[PDB]
Amino acid sequence: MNYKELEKMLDVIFENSEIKEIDLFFDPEVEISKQEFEDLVKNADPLQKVVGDNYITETFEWWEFENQYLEFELDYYVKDEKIFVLEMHFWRKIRK
Amino acid sequence: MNYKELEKMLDVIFENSEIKEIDLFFDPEVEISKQEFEDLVKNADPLQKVVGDNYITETFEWWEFENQYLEFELDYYVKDEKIFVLEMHFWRKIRK
Amino acid sequence: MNYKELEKMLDVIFENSEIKEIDLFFDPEVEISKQEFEDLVKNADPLQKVVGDNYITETFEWWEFENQYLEFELDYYVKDEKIFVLEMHFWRKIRK
Amino acid sequence: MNYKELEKMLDVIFENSEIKEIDLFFDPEVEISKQEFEDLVKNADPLQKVVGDNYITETFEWWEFENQYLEFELDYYVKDEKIFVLEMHFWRKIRK
Amino acid sequence: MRNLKRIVMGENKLIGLVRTALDSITLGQGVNEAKIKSPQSYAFHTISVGTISLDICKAIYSSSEIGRKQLENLSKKYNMPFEDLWFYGGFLHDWNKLSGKEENKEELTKKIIDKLKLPNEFLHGISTMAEGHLPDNLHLPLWVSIKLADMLLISDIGSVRDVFYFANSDSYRNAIEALKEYNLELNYVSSTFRLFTLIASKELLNDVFNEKSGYFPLISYADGIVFLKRKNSQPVLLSKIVDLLSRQVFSSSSEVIEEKISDIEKCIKNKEELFRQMNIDVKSAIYDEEGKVKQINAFLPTKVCKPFEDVVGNLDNKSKLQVAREVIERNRKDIPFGLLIYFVNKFSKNEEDYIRKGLGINEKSLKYLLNIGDVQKALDKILELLEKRYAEQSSDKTLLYYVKFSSSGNIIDDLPKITDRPNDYCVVCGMPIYSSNPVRFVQVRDDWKVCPICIYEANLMKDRVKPPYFIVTFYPGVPISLLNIIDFDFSQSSIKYYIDEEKDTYFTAFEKMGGRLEPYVKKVLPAYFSSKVIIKASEVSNFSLSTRLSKSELNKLLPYAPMISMIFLTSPVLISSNLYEMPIHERVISITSTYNYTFMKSLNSNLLTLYSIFAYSAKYDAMRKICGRSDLDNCLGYLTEEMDLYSSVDPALGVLSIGMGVGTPIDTDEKFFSAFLPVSGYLLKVTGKVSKMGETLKSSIFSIAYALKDIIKSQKVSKYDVTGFLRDGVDMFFKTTSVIKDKEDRIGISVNAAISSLENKYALDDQHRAQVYSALQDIFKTLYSIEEESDRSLAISIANTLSNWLYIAYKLVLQG
Amino acid sequence: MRNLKRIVMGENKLIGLVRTALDSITLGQGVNEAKIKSPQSYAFHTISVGTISLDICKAIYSSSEIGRKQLENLSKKYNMPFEDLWFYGGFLHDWNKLSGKEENKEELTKKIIDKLKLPNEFLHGISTMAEGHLPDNLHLPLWVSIKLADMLLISDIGSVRDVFYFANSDSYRNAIEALKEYNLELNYVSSTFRLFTLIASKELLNDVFNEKSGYFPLISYADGIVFLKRKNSQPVLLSKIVDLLSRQVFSSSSEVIEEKISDIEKCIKNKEELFRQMNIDVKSAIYDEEGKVKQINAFLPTKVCKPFEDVVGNLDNKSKLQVAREVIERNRKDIPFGLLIYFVNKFSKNEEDYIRKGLGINEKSLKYLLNIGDVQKALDKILELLEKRYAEQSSDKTLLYYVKFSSSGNIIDDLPKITDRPNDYCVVCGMPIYSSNPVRFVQVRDDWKVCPICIYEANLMKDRVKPPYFIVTFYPGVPISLLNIIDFDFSQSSIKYYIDEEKDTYFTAFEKMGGRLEPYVKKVLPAYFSSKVIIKASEVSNFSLSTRLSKSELNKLLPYAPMISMIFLTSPVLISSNLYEMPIHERVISITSTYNYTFMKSLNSNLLTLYSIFAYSAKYDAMRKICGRSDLDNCLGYLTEEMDLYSSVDPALGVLSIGMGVGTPIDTDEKFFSAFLPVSGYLLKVTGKVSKMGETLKSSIFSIAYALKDIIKSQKVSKYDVTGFLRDGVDMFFKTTSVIKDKEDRIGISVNAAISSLENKYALDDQHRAQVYSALQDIFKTLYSIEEESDRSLAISIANTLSNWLYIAYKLVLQG
Ligand SMILES: [Zn+2]
Ligand SMILES: [Zn+2]
């Protein structure tokens, strides 16, 4: 799967707050470069990283206009300096 | 959010077969017409329609290739011929 | 695992109304008799039975109090009058 | 909910490997003491803790006979030296 | 709902009969008040009639060969189990007579006979046996048992002797003459309620009035028990009654006696090296190296040595001997001189009682006497002292069965009272004291003393029957075969309060409240002879309850009061700190304590009274989540002060009482979203039926809330958005320029100001605003009526209460 | 599947017609081989007949007023759109004639006319027009267009002139005589395939043979194009042909010319301070302070200064003038002396060409000449030099249209060849060189030179047409109105290979392969006059492809070969490094390269040949997951070495070729569970139909795998558990004591040893082991036949391959 088409879908999630949560799973894994992955979270607030047995889990969040945040979680692994993503998770949370 | 935005996210799901499963949840509901709902279904096989207390759930299926089918179910409600979609589910199943 | 073990876990779910939702997944499947399956249902209202490709899904509902109902659905299959349960779902819904 | 009855249910999960995964949610929260919570994980291998905005998430794991592990995750918060649990998660994983 | 299979465990044949009858009747159908004369519920009276009818039939079956074969034929005719025919016969019979109240509408009886899965041919006999005479001669046992049960449970027979006066004079004579032919007599034994009798009454029904001797206890009436006598059976003898009940006192606990033994070992151990050394060179141990002789407090430290007659004086006479000999046998091999010095010198007021080998020497005598073999002389003088006191305290017990346990159908084996010159009278209870020892050391004028009775009551209130108490009385009486059956179990559920008048039956709501039916009741203390039953509060809640009854902790035990009532078939409940606090008497039940809040008032029906306190249980369950461990007592006080004030104008406002003035934190988001939402739909349900005002308020708030989400089709609301337009109406309604206005103008201007502030923020419809305007009229119509009554300073506090409830209903109609 | 609405974007009326026809026919139905004489598919021939019939009808419509109104009546009679009537008429007509092959079974035509949603009355005319004569006189345009399209596409008309010989002599004469009456002639122009003609042929069909001039191109046959001539239209003139095609050479890119300008600025900048200082005191700059005079390499550094006639000598004559004047205008205001010294002293082989103001002084002349105004004399001598070379290189272009672009239906405007004494001949292509300058500096014997033609071909292979190439040819020809329509897009999908013979139609599999139909084709280079089309491999894969064709990188471009074939309507595909590599000729298509592996052999049907390489695409997609970035080239080699060996005995074993001997890591769990499972069900599907052996193997492995999970009802299996009992049979089958045995005994003992080792671990059934025993016979029966053929040392390697496939099928039957 070309990252061009995945970004074509993720832009709708960033631009539509009506999207409360989205859980998507890839099979086979989608490969992206380090620059493509960094360009997605370049403007994010990193939260955690979990070095699993054979899957790296990271969590990020952004802030939106008010008390509303956009959460992001993904599981991935690295091979030959490309990033293979297992699954992605988005959901919006409101809290102080 | 209208179908013009949701169609941009659905075109990605239909083209890329790597997406094994994706779950969409809306708040508020996405408003679509009965015509746009018919065009999203006309080529799929319907399998089940159940009328909940206030949420009618309908599922469909496309044949992709070999023995892999793309299934798709909805949670929505209707008023004044307008269709408000609560949530959307897509997943690809190996069917004998 | 037999119904003698599963009944010890179900007695807790029926007594304590604080359990809002609980999902059970078996591997391998829990083997129960048609009689023990009938005794787990005889007092509930059946709502839906659908026959999957190899997994028949049936759901039931008890009235607890006021407008709160305990719903319960199954995923199972039958052979030689033996019932093998794939998974179990319990949740309590406010129904008007 | 008395912890006596919750432990009556959790013992079936520790003693039946056929239970692949269980996700249960409490509403209202179940209150237990620090000793009751420590007695559950006294023999566990702690993995992580996440100090959420108003919910503490912890993850534990045990080892079982072979390459099979039993995972545990729960979200909770403390008030008046009692522990109020929001939800619990169990699942069994096999890996080196 | 518990496992429908696990409730059937320990299936006594009577338990399933009561389960089936309660499972058949609707909850709101058995809770209904029976008659105007006394507080009786349909569930309590009908179950009692069937229970007594079951007992009388089993008595006839076990006593007469002719009644046995007659009941066998009567059972085979309808093809029903014997005890099922006997129980349901009286149960259906009582429903057919209590339905004589205005409704006739006998149609209800067909639903019961259907769910019981019984032939209607059986109902054709009952409906002609309740009124009319026998179906035929074979139904004579049922006619006798049921008519007797119907007699024994008239609205207020009120006394044991009134049964025997109703007996021969009225129309009940024909049934007793036939009971005579079944060789069964009627009999009764009157008794007075006392603390020791509460624990000991169960053993009398097993070792005296048992079926083996042929007495068959039936029912009690607060002044005695009513049972039977099969002819030529042995008479009820007082000798075994005194033999059993004095044994319950003269049988101290096997670990309490171990503690009194340890109290002795605590002293003689403190100077163990001296007592062990005294086995040789006594003159070197008793004398001090600096002077003459040591005194005994240097060997027997006063801080740790309680005198023996004060240690074991709390027990009985036989238990003192077991204490002395077990202490002697346990420690004679180690420190026999410590045992000698202890008993000889630490015997409290009877200090000089050791004259045997009593040389009269003050302290030097240890050098001038023989060895360890002399210690047994003390055990002999202990035998000669306690066995003599035993005959005196057994006589102190006897007068209770000469004066109190009286007015009986038993005969007296006891020699009369005159053991001349009773040594004293008890200072609290008044019973004559004859034993020479007792003095008032409970833990112008000279000395006061107490009898061995109310010291045994103290050893029970120390642990086994410690206050406070839940008390529930029955009118006119309660079957004994039903008292020893009903139990409860709150340990797995704590408080539960959700009940529906008709969606579930009585038994479903019975077990939902934690009610249990077990062959051996263990959490309940049935005062048999008192026609009442007492619940120890420690077995209800796990809170560290006090010994009295604090008004702040009454707010904590009250959520269990209605549950206790329903478990005991909807009967009046009293919360008290002393067993002897007497109940106050209406056609409806009452939940009361030493000091009654206004929200505990008994509404016009048992169903509404239960809902009134069940509403408080739902609020208590929310404050449990809100306020902390230390703030809750201050929180429940501010709530109770408001409920007691709102219910003083109408109980529907008592249901809506939550606070929401100031008091404890006014912060709304910390209170509504956190706890009160899951119980709001139930509190509103209770409000809509406790009064006509509450029905007007419930329908008006929902008619606005339904119209609010219909206009505000988005969840973007603030707290001020849905409540602001109403607050502008309340401000208009209470400012002094509008308070002077006429009634039709003051309500008309305020509702116009309410809709005017609403339409400036959102768009209404011409046909849609009319229902909001009509509901706002009814709201301000009630705000005027609760200002005619009461005060402006309270109507404003109620308006703020109602204004916040509108926010609650808006969040409640979106829950679906 | 793409959005069924977004494919319709850019809807050329022909595109929807081809989409509808392909959507109507089954995939395995259009892929079918047409006739035995030449490689043709049902999809290619029938679509071509309809496309040409559409072109001839639109030509008649646009050329004759009488045919226009005749087509209007014919369209209104059936009530169909004009072009829909014209296209589907020839499409259905060709299916009705190609079905003459043995099956008659004309029942297939009813499915097509139904899905097209067309009246069967139209089919009644076609089924009587394909055989028989006119339905009536009004159908004359269809009879002409379709019979001409049927003629133009006979299995191998093979040549442009063969059309005009088939024309008048055979039965096709009646259609052309009627085409005469529609004032439409036939015509053709022969041309030779060349690299520059590949990019330039598209412009000829737009600026020469366009509809505006009335020529209507139809089809090409590798030796020319066939078009039409409406009577009294202008003749095809060579003057505009040479005018347009020489312009494509004499139009260097606007950024390539900017680069050659920057190559000049790179030199004159290196010593900018000296050229700027030369505006005054030239004698102080040209002379060195230590001696006499400096030489020009101190001002014009050799490392950075390429001579001008070598810099811009790669471009054309007009582009050299634009380079010189743009460099002059850009830098005259700053360093005019650097511009002077550069052109005067760095002009390469024509060094002395600056005689104008050429004092003959070697280096001192800068002191002895006039100022900046003299620089324009160089621009004049550049104009007089390049405009003269322009007339010589335009003459060098002309002979291509005198000798190669020949055998035509056009007239010659050009003056004949004799520009006497051609200066040389090209050393590679052979065309005569006349311009005085060119020498072979491409980047016994004296000097070799090259013409301006194949230097323009080099500037195209540098970027625009860089090798390698996918090449697909058509037999006997391909419609031109279809070449400029077909395109592809692999950028969003990469490789796709899942096809079903009948579950989806041709168009579904067409778009599934990434095929596109667009009005302006952009990723495809149609060699029009060559009846073939060339695909640049850089627009297929994103890999850094080499300039030749490595055998290790052929394994990487091959997964795209079958996709290219299907997109171009199932036509033979050739992978090559040079455009001019000529195809080898069977009734079935062939996928080939310079060196052919055995697994690329063409099976007995186009469907099986595609499955043969589609099986390799599935394996390549798994190795993509397994081996790393550097190991993959070594991985694909070990796989290809096995496939080429297994397919040498049977192609079904080529489908089952994966490796699993040793070679690259034998670790099975790292290979099966990681990549090969999702494609195993497809590889087995291909195996069960490429040969009778594969059908025997597929049914036997599944019959064991189905029976394995039926016996081993648990997932507790190890790798050795499901494969061990078979390995014990293979060991029994190949040990030298049993290899000598007779055929019926060697297979009978090995299957007995297989089931014996199985029954010792698990329990079988009497009726259940028979199917396992019968399948093991067929397996070892094939292991004997692949030992009769081939070797024991290979049959063991195949046995290990089959033994691992049993583990694959066991994990495959549990996937559901
Ligand atoms: Zn006393
Ligand atoms: Zn050349």
Residue numbers in the entry:
A (entry chain B), B (entry chain A), C (entry chain A), D (entry chain B): 1 to 96
E (entry chain C), F (entry chain C): 1 to 103, 107 to 446, 471 to 611, 613 to 844
Please quote the paper that reports this structure.
To understand the molecular architecture of the unique type I-D system as well as mechanism of inhibition by AcrID1, we reconstituted the Cas10d–AcrID1 complex in vitro and determined the crystal structure to 3.5 Å resolution by single-wavelength anomalous dispersion (SAD) phasing using Se–Met substitution. The net result of these interactions is that two AcrID1 dimers sequester two Cas10d subunits into a large, circular 4:2 complex. In the 2:4 complex of Cas10d and AcrID1 there are no direct interactions between the two Cas10d subunits but several specific interactions between both AcrID1 monomers and each domain of Cas10d that effectively cross-link the Cas10d subunits. These interactions tie one AcrID1 monomer (chain A) to the HD nuclease, Palm/RRM, and Thumb/Cas11 domains of one Cas10d subunit and the other AcrID1 monomer (chain B) to the Cyclase/RRM and C-terminal Thumb domains of another Cas10d subunit. The interactions between AcrID1 and the HD nuclease domain are especially intriguing because they involve an N terminal extension of Cas10d (residues 1–13) for which specific contacts are made to both Asn3 and Arg6.
Type I-D CRISPR–Cas systems, which are found both in bacteria and archaea, are exceptional in that they contain a hybrid large subunit, Cas10d, bearing resemblance to both the signature proteins found in type I (Cas3) and type III (Cas10). In this paper, we demonstrate that the S. islandicus type I-D large subunit, Cas10d, has a unique structure consisting of a type I-like HD nuclease domain joined to a set of inactivated type III-like nucleotidyl transferase domains and a Cas11-like C-terminal domain.
